């Protein structure tokens, strides 16, 4: 089921230098909560400044949903350390409040008023918030409080040399392989096998607290439960075809969306009634990206310069790390992305891509189940999970040797050894571990307990890269960037919307 | 997709006498049922004697589950006639009971009520029954009532010869492992043609099933649900990581499985309130418990295990277990089928088979699954292992049959006549018209009268045939003698035991 | 044979402050006996209250098997005093019952029906008792009545700091460091039973060796029979493929073992006529059934197992479990032992320790075995792993002690005083003269009066000492408060049980 | 437990050609028996000629105990085929008789009258026979009918040359003595894998013996009872450190009295019983699991030959008869020994005393009586049992496999590596071993039953098979030549046996 990559691997083993210069970036989300596990209703904390302009710290869908962001980085440890500074600072400057360590919220009722992300009075800020309002009215607020971790990754220019359009075509290859084989991610690092009742077909088992869980599950975050664009026939074979599918989607009405309406008593309800308001409304486990310019849309930018990097978006929050992501995970994704770039990927239609989901779903709902088998696309399940994983890891291990040879030491290889172990025993995986803790204490209990311990820890730890003064400065500067946008003579919102993306 | 077998074929055409003396054998399973289609709850018919020792007629899982076995035989007609005599005698000696003519039984409400095969109070008889008790407890009784046909096959020595010392047993072995590998690759042609289980009763339960008010589930283009995951409870040899490249490897993998404890079956416990529930708590209680569509074999010497015997003498012959019951024959198997299998097996021995890893083998299965579930689907395409599907089924079968026809020409020239050739012409037509296959035929019947109605009717018709037909090879007096003799042997084993079953058991589990 | 640890000692002597703030803990076990040495068959003393939940006093495998436990502590005298209090208080609240002075029981028969530790009706409490049921059925009750002392030990943050350990790094460098410690404990930790081993002899009712008879079995030159194959029944971690090179490997190996079905234990069956016999039939029922003379630890959150905790947070502290009961102290452990252990652990952290395969670990045991059965033997030599024995034991200990002395100079300079150094001078003498060790001493006594006789005598003397002594840290009221807090924490859990035992048992076994 | 041989192995991989030209030989014993299994009482078959002087076919203790011998050989396949031609020819020329396929006899009665091997009127021949008479009277006849396989092994010169005239000649004896010390330590691995006598007929009988209804004794987890106290002196003090010490200890053994053997007498009723009353009648009465050797001339004792030329080759004698081969041995075995013997020559072995040697036996006994027993542990010498058997085996096979890589690189192909993969699997699973396999068959149909059946199939197999290397002509030629040699020796014989014996006893 794993394809034959023997040829491309040998090539790589003979061009090791061609991997030197990997660029990475992390994004990690977390809910601000009270000590009692309730959703914080205070505003974005003072010391962090302007969520709308800050370079490193901002908000996602909700006002209480922190989003931490690292600068693009060449060094793993540096980047994780940077990310940890952000957390250190924030944990110290947010009152008696703390950071929720899990993907899944707990203490949140059904229909609970969730303050949307607040970006001020500028056009840009209003738009951002409106997009959110939009999302609230189409999909519900609740599911939007589910947090995750995003990983940015680019291969060095050297890699494509050794072997623009060649580049974009290469990243499309990567994405296609991610669709076929990336269920490996929730298997290993998936960390949401349970969900609060408040949050609701499946064989769910219920506890006395009213915790719902699937015995063998991995990542309910990624399930239909946690996350409608199936009539879009978006494809990943080719730059122009992808973009074209993306654009036509922007211009694709919706019956469901025309209903909500744009307005009611003057309140704008959404940006538009199109299936996609903006392009990023598009569901994407993995996403082709190019840094955009000003007034330039993601598709414009892609079209212009081709694919620059990719964004992996399938990771749940790592509960066992205070920054919600660790070295082991980062290193695994390096290995995996590279492999995805080496492996041979036939072109896939729309419906063929949708078919690659069946394996994802199986892994998501029951990945840790003994005897579990996977299948090729929609076809009958045939292949035992553990053997597939071992096959995959034989290859990754080879990638790892190469990578360890250029970087020096054996860090990647050790990581392969460590995770391969998880195929012979699923009880080693994140989901099994966190599930054991959740059955005894519940989601809430586990959440508060971790959140508290992490709070103490992070609070008492020194700043390493970002000093206190760097934060104070960026606060001040971000507040000011926002005020400058606010005070500017911007255009009428209407025609403005009209001239966007 | 069919490989190139030109030389092996030209080689064969020049060495025709290399195929002379093919040895074959048949086994056929069937449920003893009442007129209403339900399992007979009576004991093994007394006229059939001891199921434990009987030469031709025994039982499988269930007490009601008959197993017919023919002696190894070089003549096809004689073998089929022999099998039929077994059915004829049985048919007239089971009171008002009859035989279920389908692989898939009719609605069963209470699986756990199904009387296990009974073998008396001898230690060996009790071991055999306990083995089944274990199967019941591990996998459920219900699915063990699903039935099929087994075809045993050996090439003549002259075949190997035309193709020294300690190397002979080894070369023969490697030849048979090649056959097996090829079966895994191309063997799906078997359920395509002769598959006869497109439907299943809901009592026996993700898939696009059509449903009926009575609870008959089916798939429109399916061939053999019996071979699907829904049709067997066991662990496929292919899934356990057992491979077919090398004799020693294969044997080791198998014995490893006999020896490996199971968390799952330990949880059942080896006991519960003085009732022994299993033989042991290992993956495989014994070697037979392994699910094998195709199995290497060598006749055992007393006390020796099947894998022991393989290791000792290498591979002697092959057992093809993948045939559904043929509903269009009273004996559940026909001449056209046996002849096809002769052709295909021979071809599997000529065709070149690269060695395969666990996961490579698993890939050969992708095509099997397609054929099993939607084999009759217009426009169906097959692939090379896991690789993208691109080869239209009808063309692939025509290509295989051009080779099979050459094999047929050769066998036809040594036996005299045109029988094998005719068979190729009859069967190849099924690739252009899939409504000619067994599965399409039986599905039509089933949609009209159900599994139950279709089965009750054929069972009745076949009972009436088999009740009236005179015995051809065996005569009444032979069944009577074998009754006496078989009872006698069971009696002797019972008396000859010197130890408590618990003591004897500790020593053989 | 002792490594060159120069560089690291030098370093240490320059960073004395780095050793400040060592945390410790003790656990001691003792059988409640009657005056006549027989096993007390009453129940956990009222005054002590709830064994299941009590913060300081509890039970081990038997209802009569007392287990005393001190809070984590940075101060040696305080910790020991605390433990002494528990004993004092207990020894006056248990009738004419007294505490067995030794590791090795006596007056306990091979078939004796020993009452299992009783922890109530709650689910948690019931599981606890069943764990024990299973221990009995698998290994035998008697063996589990052997008693010992556990020493917990963590280095201060300052130590690691002084020795880049920030953010995430810390957790790993500390873990690594403690694995270095364990490895070195396997190589060099035989020094412990040499010095402190106190079971030269064993009762008839318990038992290959050159044993000598009296009804008492003894070895002339033996140290700790309790650490021998005749002393613990379990499966040594060293034996199960478990290694100490790396946090993840270690945990993986441990987790593998609790998931490993055992043929042997499956036969015990898991239910024996309504009576549940074990939690399950796996090699290890729960992770703590693993035989571990030195054990890596992290404080467990509810819902999490020892391995989960380790995986999450890394190694926090070490548990040393190979100490026999010190006969010469009424609390079974003394200040000289505790101080030696600090010294030895510290040195174990400094000394370089190559990584070790599980077969190289097995090799380290050769020396242990020699010491355990003949450590006090004149002319006894030790080897580098499995390699030829060539290093006289006394010289090896002297060499080790020249290092431990330097380490003591350092701890003494920080605490103020000479206590550690004194301990080194006293103990090193045991290498020139083995008759100074605990084993020689207690052996002389056991030969004269027997195990039985020796035990009774010391038990009655110590009982009298402790029944007379004032409490010092704990007031009679602190104890009385805990019967309550304890006896109620238990009820609370007994009302919280929604789900029955079988349904809950099944999320956990 | 398994030493560190990393450096020697690394050395080996750098110098692959050091193993090119390994030399070997096989010997194989088997009883002539009827279809009912009873002992054949006819004489040494006629197409085979003179047992006394034949080059390839001969007799051991009993006249019915055949002994097959191959010429020294460099090619594995060729040597096996050769041994096989011998069996084929014989199988067709022994009438209705056939060859007992196991080490352990069954149809032989306790205190039975077995015809001693007969070698004719010659001084020499009468001596050979008298020796056996001696063994009969000393140890009992029955035990001498237990059969086995011997393997000869020598390293090529190129091996020694690359490890380093006559400065070389002492370097070799030391190398083989090392091989032998290591064999004593780790060689129990042989009966573990290939031992095939877990059972013994009651005729041959304080052990935990289990017993069937046929009257067949067995141990559950046993491997090779032939090697045990029941299947075949420890005061001799023979060591393997040095060539002189060894030869001295051995000559001293022959000059050494035995009050047990003095009681037998040297003669009763004109009937000579032994050669003498000494602890060993001759040097080769010495019990030896493994034996250092040099090709003896004529008039040379084995000790003399050694003393003179040094150790030329090694003789491995602990092999049970392989029941699953018509010739009682197979390629897989032969290859394993190549590996092991080579490994034995690479691994450091300290010098050993008598009592240290005796201690190596503790493990041997464990493996022999219960080597298939789960959780079985082994120890260094007499020391505490500590090391799980499976893992010891695997450690060993880790090294054997590196050796195998090397040998496969020069011979071409992957045959040696494959053998490693197969045999190591016997460590995870004893039920793959010979003894486990044979035991299942024996429990069901007895030693007797299993034997007769295997013999019968092998007879038929072999009778039908064509000669491949030897031709009949060759066998008929060797028959004549072997006949003259006996005649020429019976002719040119000076004095009456009564006095020739006067210098050789």
The burial class, CB within 10 Å (0-12 / 13-18 / 19+), for D50 is buried
Helical pair A411-424 and A327-342, crossing angle rounded to 10 deg:
90
The span from the CA of C419 to the CA of C410, in Å, is 11
Experimental technique of record: X-ray
Contact residues, chain D, for B253 at CB < 8 Å: none
A84 touching C, CB under 8 A? yes
Residues A286 and A341 placed together within one structural domain of the fold: yes
Structure tokens, C142: 């008697």
B460-470 core/surface letters (b: 16 or more CB in 10 A; e: else): eebbeebeeee
- To the nearest whole angstrom, how far is the Cα of A441 from the nearest Cα of chain C? 6
The span from the CA of B90 to the CA of B102, in Å, is 17
* 8 A C-beta contact, residue B219 and residue B225: yes
CB neighbourhood size of A486 (10 A): 15
Give the A:C interface size as CB pairs under 8 Å. 59
Chain B residue nearest residue C264, CA to CA = B261
Residue C32, Cα to own-chain centre: how many angstroms? Answer: 19
HEC profile of D164-195: CCCCCHHHHHHHHHHHHHHHHHHCCHHHHHHC
Instruction: Decide if D440 and B305 are in contact by the 8 Å CB cutoff.
Output: yes
- CB under 8 Å to B339, separation ≥6 — which residues? B76, B419, B420, B423
Q: Give partners of B (≥3 CB pairs < 8 A).
A: A, C, D
The span from the CA of B51 to the CA of D46, in Å, is 52
Residues C384 and C372 placed together within one structural domain of the fold: no
Contact residues, chain B, for C267 at CB < 8 Å: 270
D143: region left, alpha or beta (phi > 0 left; psi from -120 to 50 alpha): alpha
Residues A63 and A135 placed together within one structural domain of the fold: yes
Task: Report CA-CA distances (Å) from B415 to B15, B20, B83, B420, C136.
Answer: 14, 8, 22, 10, 72
The burial class, CB within 10 Å (0-12 / 13-18 / 19+), for D1 is buried
Structure tokens, D145: 């009918």
B386 touching A, CB under 8 A? yes
DSSP reduced 3-state for A470: helix
The burial class, CB within 10 Å (0-12 / 13-18 / 19+), for D36 is exposed
Closest to A356 (Cα-Cα) out of A143, A225, A175: A175
Residues D74 and D183 placed together within one structural domain of the fold: yes
- CB under 8 Å to D245, separation ≥6 — which residues? D239
For residue A339, the surrounding DSSP H or E stretch is helix A327-342
Residues C370 and C385 placed together within one structural domain of the fold: no
Residues D308 and D245 placed together within one structural domain of the fold: yes
HEC profile of B208-262: CCEECCCCEEECCCCCECCCCCCCCCCCECCCCCCCCCCHHHHHHHHHHHHHCEC
The span from the CA of B337 to the CA of B193, in Å, is 9
Task: Write phi, then psi, for D485 (nearest 5 degrees).
Answer: -60, -45
How many domains is chain D built from? 2
Scan for tokens 């091979």, then name that residue: C110
**DSSP class of C106:** -
The span from the CA of C284 to the CA of C290, in Å, is 7
The span from the CA of A323 to the CA of A70, in Å, is 12
Chain C residue nearest residue D4, CA to CA = C387
B267 touching C, CB under 8 A? yes
Contact residues, chain B, for D468 at CB < 8 Å: 164-165
* 8 A C-beta contact, residue C504 and residue C497: yes
Domain closes at, from C390, C406, C432: C432
Domain closes at, from A424, A456, A489: A424
Strands A267-268 and C201-203: what pairing?
unpaired
* 8 A C-beta contact, residue A260 and residue A270: yes
Q: Could you tell me which residues are beta bridge partners of residue B24? A: B73, B153
- To the nearest whole angstrom, how far is the Cα of D387 from the nearest Cα of chain C? 7
The span from the CA of D153 to the CA of D159, in Å, is 13
Chain D residue nearest residue C241, CA to CA = D391
For residue C314, the surrounding DSSP H or E stretch is none
- To the nearest whole angstrom, how far is the Cα of C369 from the nearest Cα of chain D? 7
* Alpha helices per DSSP H over D434-496: 434-464, 472-491
- To the nearest whole angstrom, how far is the Cα of B502 from the nearest Cα of chain C? 12
Instruction: Name which of B266, B272, B274 is nearest C281 (Cβ-Cβ).
Output: B266
D391 touching C, CB under 8 A? yes
The span from the CA of A119 to the CA of A133, in Å, is 13
Domain closes at, from D389, D411, D428: D428
Give, in degrees to the nearest 5, the angle at Cα D322 between D317 and D324: 170
Residues A403 and A439 placed together within one structural domain of the fold: no
Q: Could you tell me which residues are beta bridge partners of residue A271? A: none
DSSP reduced 3-state for A44: coil
HEC profile of C390-458: CEEHHHHHHHHHHHHHHHHHHHHHHHCCCHHHHHHHHHHHHHHCHHHCHHHHHHHHHHHHHHHHHHHHH
**DSSP class of D432:** G
Q: Which domain holds residue A415?
A: 2-16+371-424
Chain D residue nearest residue C264, CA to CA = D374
The span from the CA of D427 to the CA of D415, in Å, is 20
The span from the CA of D432 to the CA of D436, in Å, is 7
Instruction: Decide if D444 and B255 are in contact by the 8 Å CB cutoff.
Output: no
For residue A428, the surrounding DSSP H or E stretch is none
The span from the CA of C408 to the CA of C419, in Å, is 8
Instruction: Decide if D422 and B498 are in contact by the 8 Å CB cutoff.
Output: no
Q: Could you tell me which residues are beta bridge partners of residue B201? A: B216
The span from the CA of D150 to the CA of C467, in Å, is 76
Instruction: Decide if D330 and B258 are in contact by the 8 Å CB cutoff.
Output: no
Residues A144 and A57 placed together within one structural domain of the fold: yes
**Interface-testing mutation among B265, B266, B270, with chain C (most C C-beta atoms within 10 A):** B266
DSSP reduced 3-state for B105: coil
The span from the CA of C489 to the CA of C49, in Å, is 11
Strand extents, DSSP E, A329-382: 373-374
* Alpha helices per DSSP H over A382-410: 385-407
Q: Give partners of A (≥3 CB pairs < 8 A).
A: B, C
* 8 A C-beta contact, residue D133 and residue D272: yes
**CATH number assigned to the domain comprising residue B369:** 3.30.590.20
* 8 A C-beta contact, residue B230 and residue B204: yes
C251 touching A, CB under 8 A? yes
Scan for tokens 């460091």, then name that residue: C177
CB neighbourhood size of B120 (10 A): 18
DSSP reduced 3-state for C336: helix
Q: Could you tell me which residues are beta bridge partners of residue A227? A: none
Task: Write phi, then psi, for C456 (nearest 5 degrees).
Answer: -60, -55
Could you give the dihedral angle defined by the CA atoms of residues D322, D327, D332 and D333, in that order, rounded to the nearest 10 degrees? 50
Instruction: Name which of A373, A379, A388 is nearest B370 (Cβ-Cβ).
Output: A379
Instruction: Name which of C167, C256, C498 is nearest A84 (Cβ-Cβ).
Output: C167
For residue A331, the surrounding DSSP H or E stretch is helix A327-342
Secondary structure of chain B: what % helix, strand, coil (to 5)?
Answer: 50, 15, 40
Torsion over CA: A382, A384, A389, A391 (sign) = negative
DSSP reduced 3-state for D21: coil
Contact residues, chain B, for C259 at CB < 8 Å: 263
Residues B415 and B333 placed together within one structural domain of the fold: no
Contact residues, chain A, for B365 at CB < 8 Å: 382
Contact residues, chain A, for C255 at CB < 8 Å: 425, 427-428
DSSP reduced 3-state for C69: strand
Closest to D369 (Cα-Cα) out of D188, D104, D203, D215: D188
DSSP reduced 3-state for D479: helix
- To the nearest whole angstrom, how far is the Cα of C53 from the nearest Cα of chain A? 17
For residue D253, the surrounding DSSP H or E stretch is helix D243-254
* 8 A C-beta contact, residue C203 and residue C37: no
Residues D411 and D471 placed together within one structural domain of the fold: no
Strands B65-69 and B57-59: what pairing?
antiparallel
Closest to C344 (Cα-Cα) out of C244, C196, C228, C226: C196
Contact residues, chain A, for C498 at CB < 8 Å: 208
Q: What order do you get walking across the sheet with B210-211 strand by strand?
A: B199-201, B216-218, B210-211
Residues D250 and D335 placed together within one structural domain of the fold: yes
Residues C269 and C406 placed together within one structural domain of the fold: no
C1-28 core/surface letters (b: 16 or more CB in 10 A; e: else): bbbebeebbeebeeeeebbeebbbbbbb
Structure tokens, D94: 């022994």
Closest to C313 (Cα-Cα) out of A456, A32, A315: A456
For residue C178, the surrounding DSSP H or E stretch is helix C169-188
Closest to C138 (Cα-Cα) out of C281, C258, C256: C281
- To the nearest whole angstrom, how far is the Cα of A22 from the nearest Cα of chain C? 22
D73-76 — which CB contacts under 8 Å span 24+ positions? D73/D23, D73/D24, D73/D25, D74/D21, D74/D22, D74/D23, D74/D24, D76/D24, D76/D331, D76/D334, D76/D335
Strands C23-33 and B65-69: what pairing?
unpaired
Q: Give partners of C (≥3 CB pairs < 8 A).
A: A, B, D
* 8 A C-beta contact, residue C415 and residue C403: no
Task: Report CA-CA distances (Å) from D166 to A318, D170, D175, D304, D483.
Answer: 72, 7, 15, 18, 40
For residue C461, the surrounding DSSP H or E stretch is helix C438-468
Write the DSSP assignment of B110-156 as a string of letters: -GGGSPBPP--SSHHHHHHHHHHHHHHHHH-SGGGG--EEEEEEE--
């Amino acid at each position: 089921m794993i394809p034959d990559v023997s040829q491309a691997l040998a090539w790589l083993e003979k061009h090791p230098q061609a991997l030197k210069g990997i660029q990475r970036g992390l994004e990690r989300e977390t809910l601000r909560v009270n000590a009692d596990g309730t959703l914080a209703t205070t505003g974005h904390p003072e010391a962090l400044g302007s969520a709308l302009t800050h370079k490193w710290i901002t908000t996602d869908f909700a006002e209480a949903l922190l989003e931490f962001i690292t600068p693009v980085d060449g060094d793993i440890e540096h980047m994780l350390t940077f990310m940890r500074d952000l957390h250190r600072y924030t944990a110290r400057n947010m009152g008696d409040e703390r950071m929720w360590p899990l993907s899944m919220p707990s203490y949140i009722a059904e229909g609970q008023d969730i303050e949307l992300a607040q970006y001020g009075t500028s056009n840009t800020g209003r738009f951002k918030t409106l997009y959110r309002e939009g999302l609230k009215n189409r999909y519900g607020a609740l599911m939007q409080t589910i947090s995750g971790v995003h990983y940015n990754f680019s291969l060095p220019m050297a890699f494509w040399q050794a072997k623009k359009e060649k580049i974009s075509a290469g990243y499309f290859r990567v994405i296609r392989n991610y669709y076929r084989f990336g269920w490996v991610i929730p298997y290993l690092f998936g960390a949401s096998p349970a969900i609060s009742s408040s949050f609701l077909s499946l064989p769910f088992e219920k506890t006395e607290s009213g915790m719902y869980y699937l015995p063998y599950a991995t990542s309910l975050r990624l399930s239909d439960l946690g996350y409608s664009q199936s009539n879009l026939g978006i494809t990943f074979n080719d730059l122009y075809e992808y973009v074209a599918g993306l654009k036509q989607a922007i211009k694709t009405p919706s019956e469901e969306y025309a209903k909500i309406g744009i307005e009611k008593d003057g309140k704008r309800l959404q940006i538009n009634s199109n299936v996609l308001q903006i392009e990023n409304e598009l569901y994407a486990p993995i996403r082709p990206k190019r840094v955009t310019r000003s007034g330039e849309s993601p598709s414009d930018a892609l079209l212009r310069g081709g694919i620059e990097y990719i964004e992996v978006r399938s990771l749940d929050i790592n509960p066992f790390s205070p920054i919600g992501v660790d070295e082991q995970q980062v290193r695994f994704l390096d290995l995996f992305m590279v492999w995805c770039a080496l492996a041979d990927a036939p072109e896939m239609s729309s419906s063929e891509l949708a078919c690659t989901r069946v394996n994802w779903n199986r892994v998501i709902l029951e990945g840790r189940k003994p005897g579990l088998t996977l299948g090729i696309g929609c076809e009958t399940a045939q292949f035992p999970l553990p053997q597939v994983g071992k096959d995959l890891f034989r290859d990754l291990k080879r990638v790892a040797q190469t990578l360890d040879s250029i970087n020096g030491g054996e860090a990647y290889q050790k990581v392969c050894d460590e995770l391969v172990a998880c195929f012979d025993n699923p009880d080693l995986t994140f989901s099994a571990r966190i599930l054991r803790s959740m059955i005894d204490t519940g989601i809430g209990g586990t959440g508060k307990a971790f959140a508290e311990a992490y709070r103490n820890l992070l609070r008492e730890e020194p700043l390493e890269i970002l000093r206190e003064e760097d934060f104070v400065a960026e606060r001040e500067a971000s507040e000011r960037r926002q005020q400058e946008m606010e005070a500017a003579d911007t255009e009428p919102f209407a025609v403005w919307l009209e001239k966007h993306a």
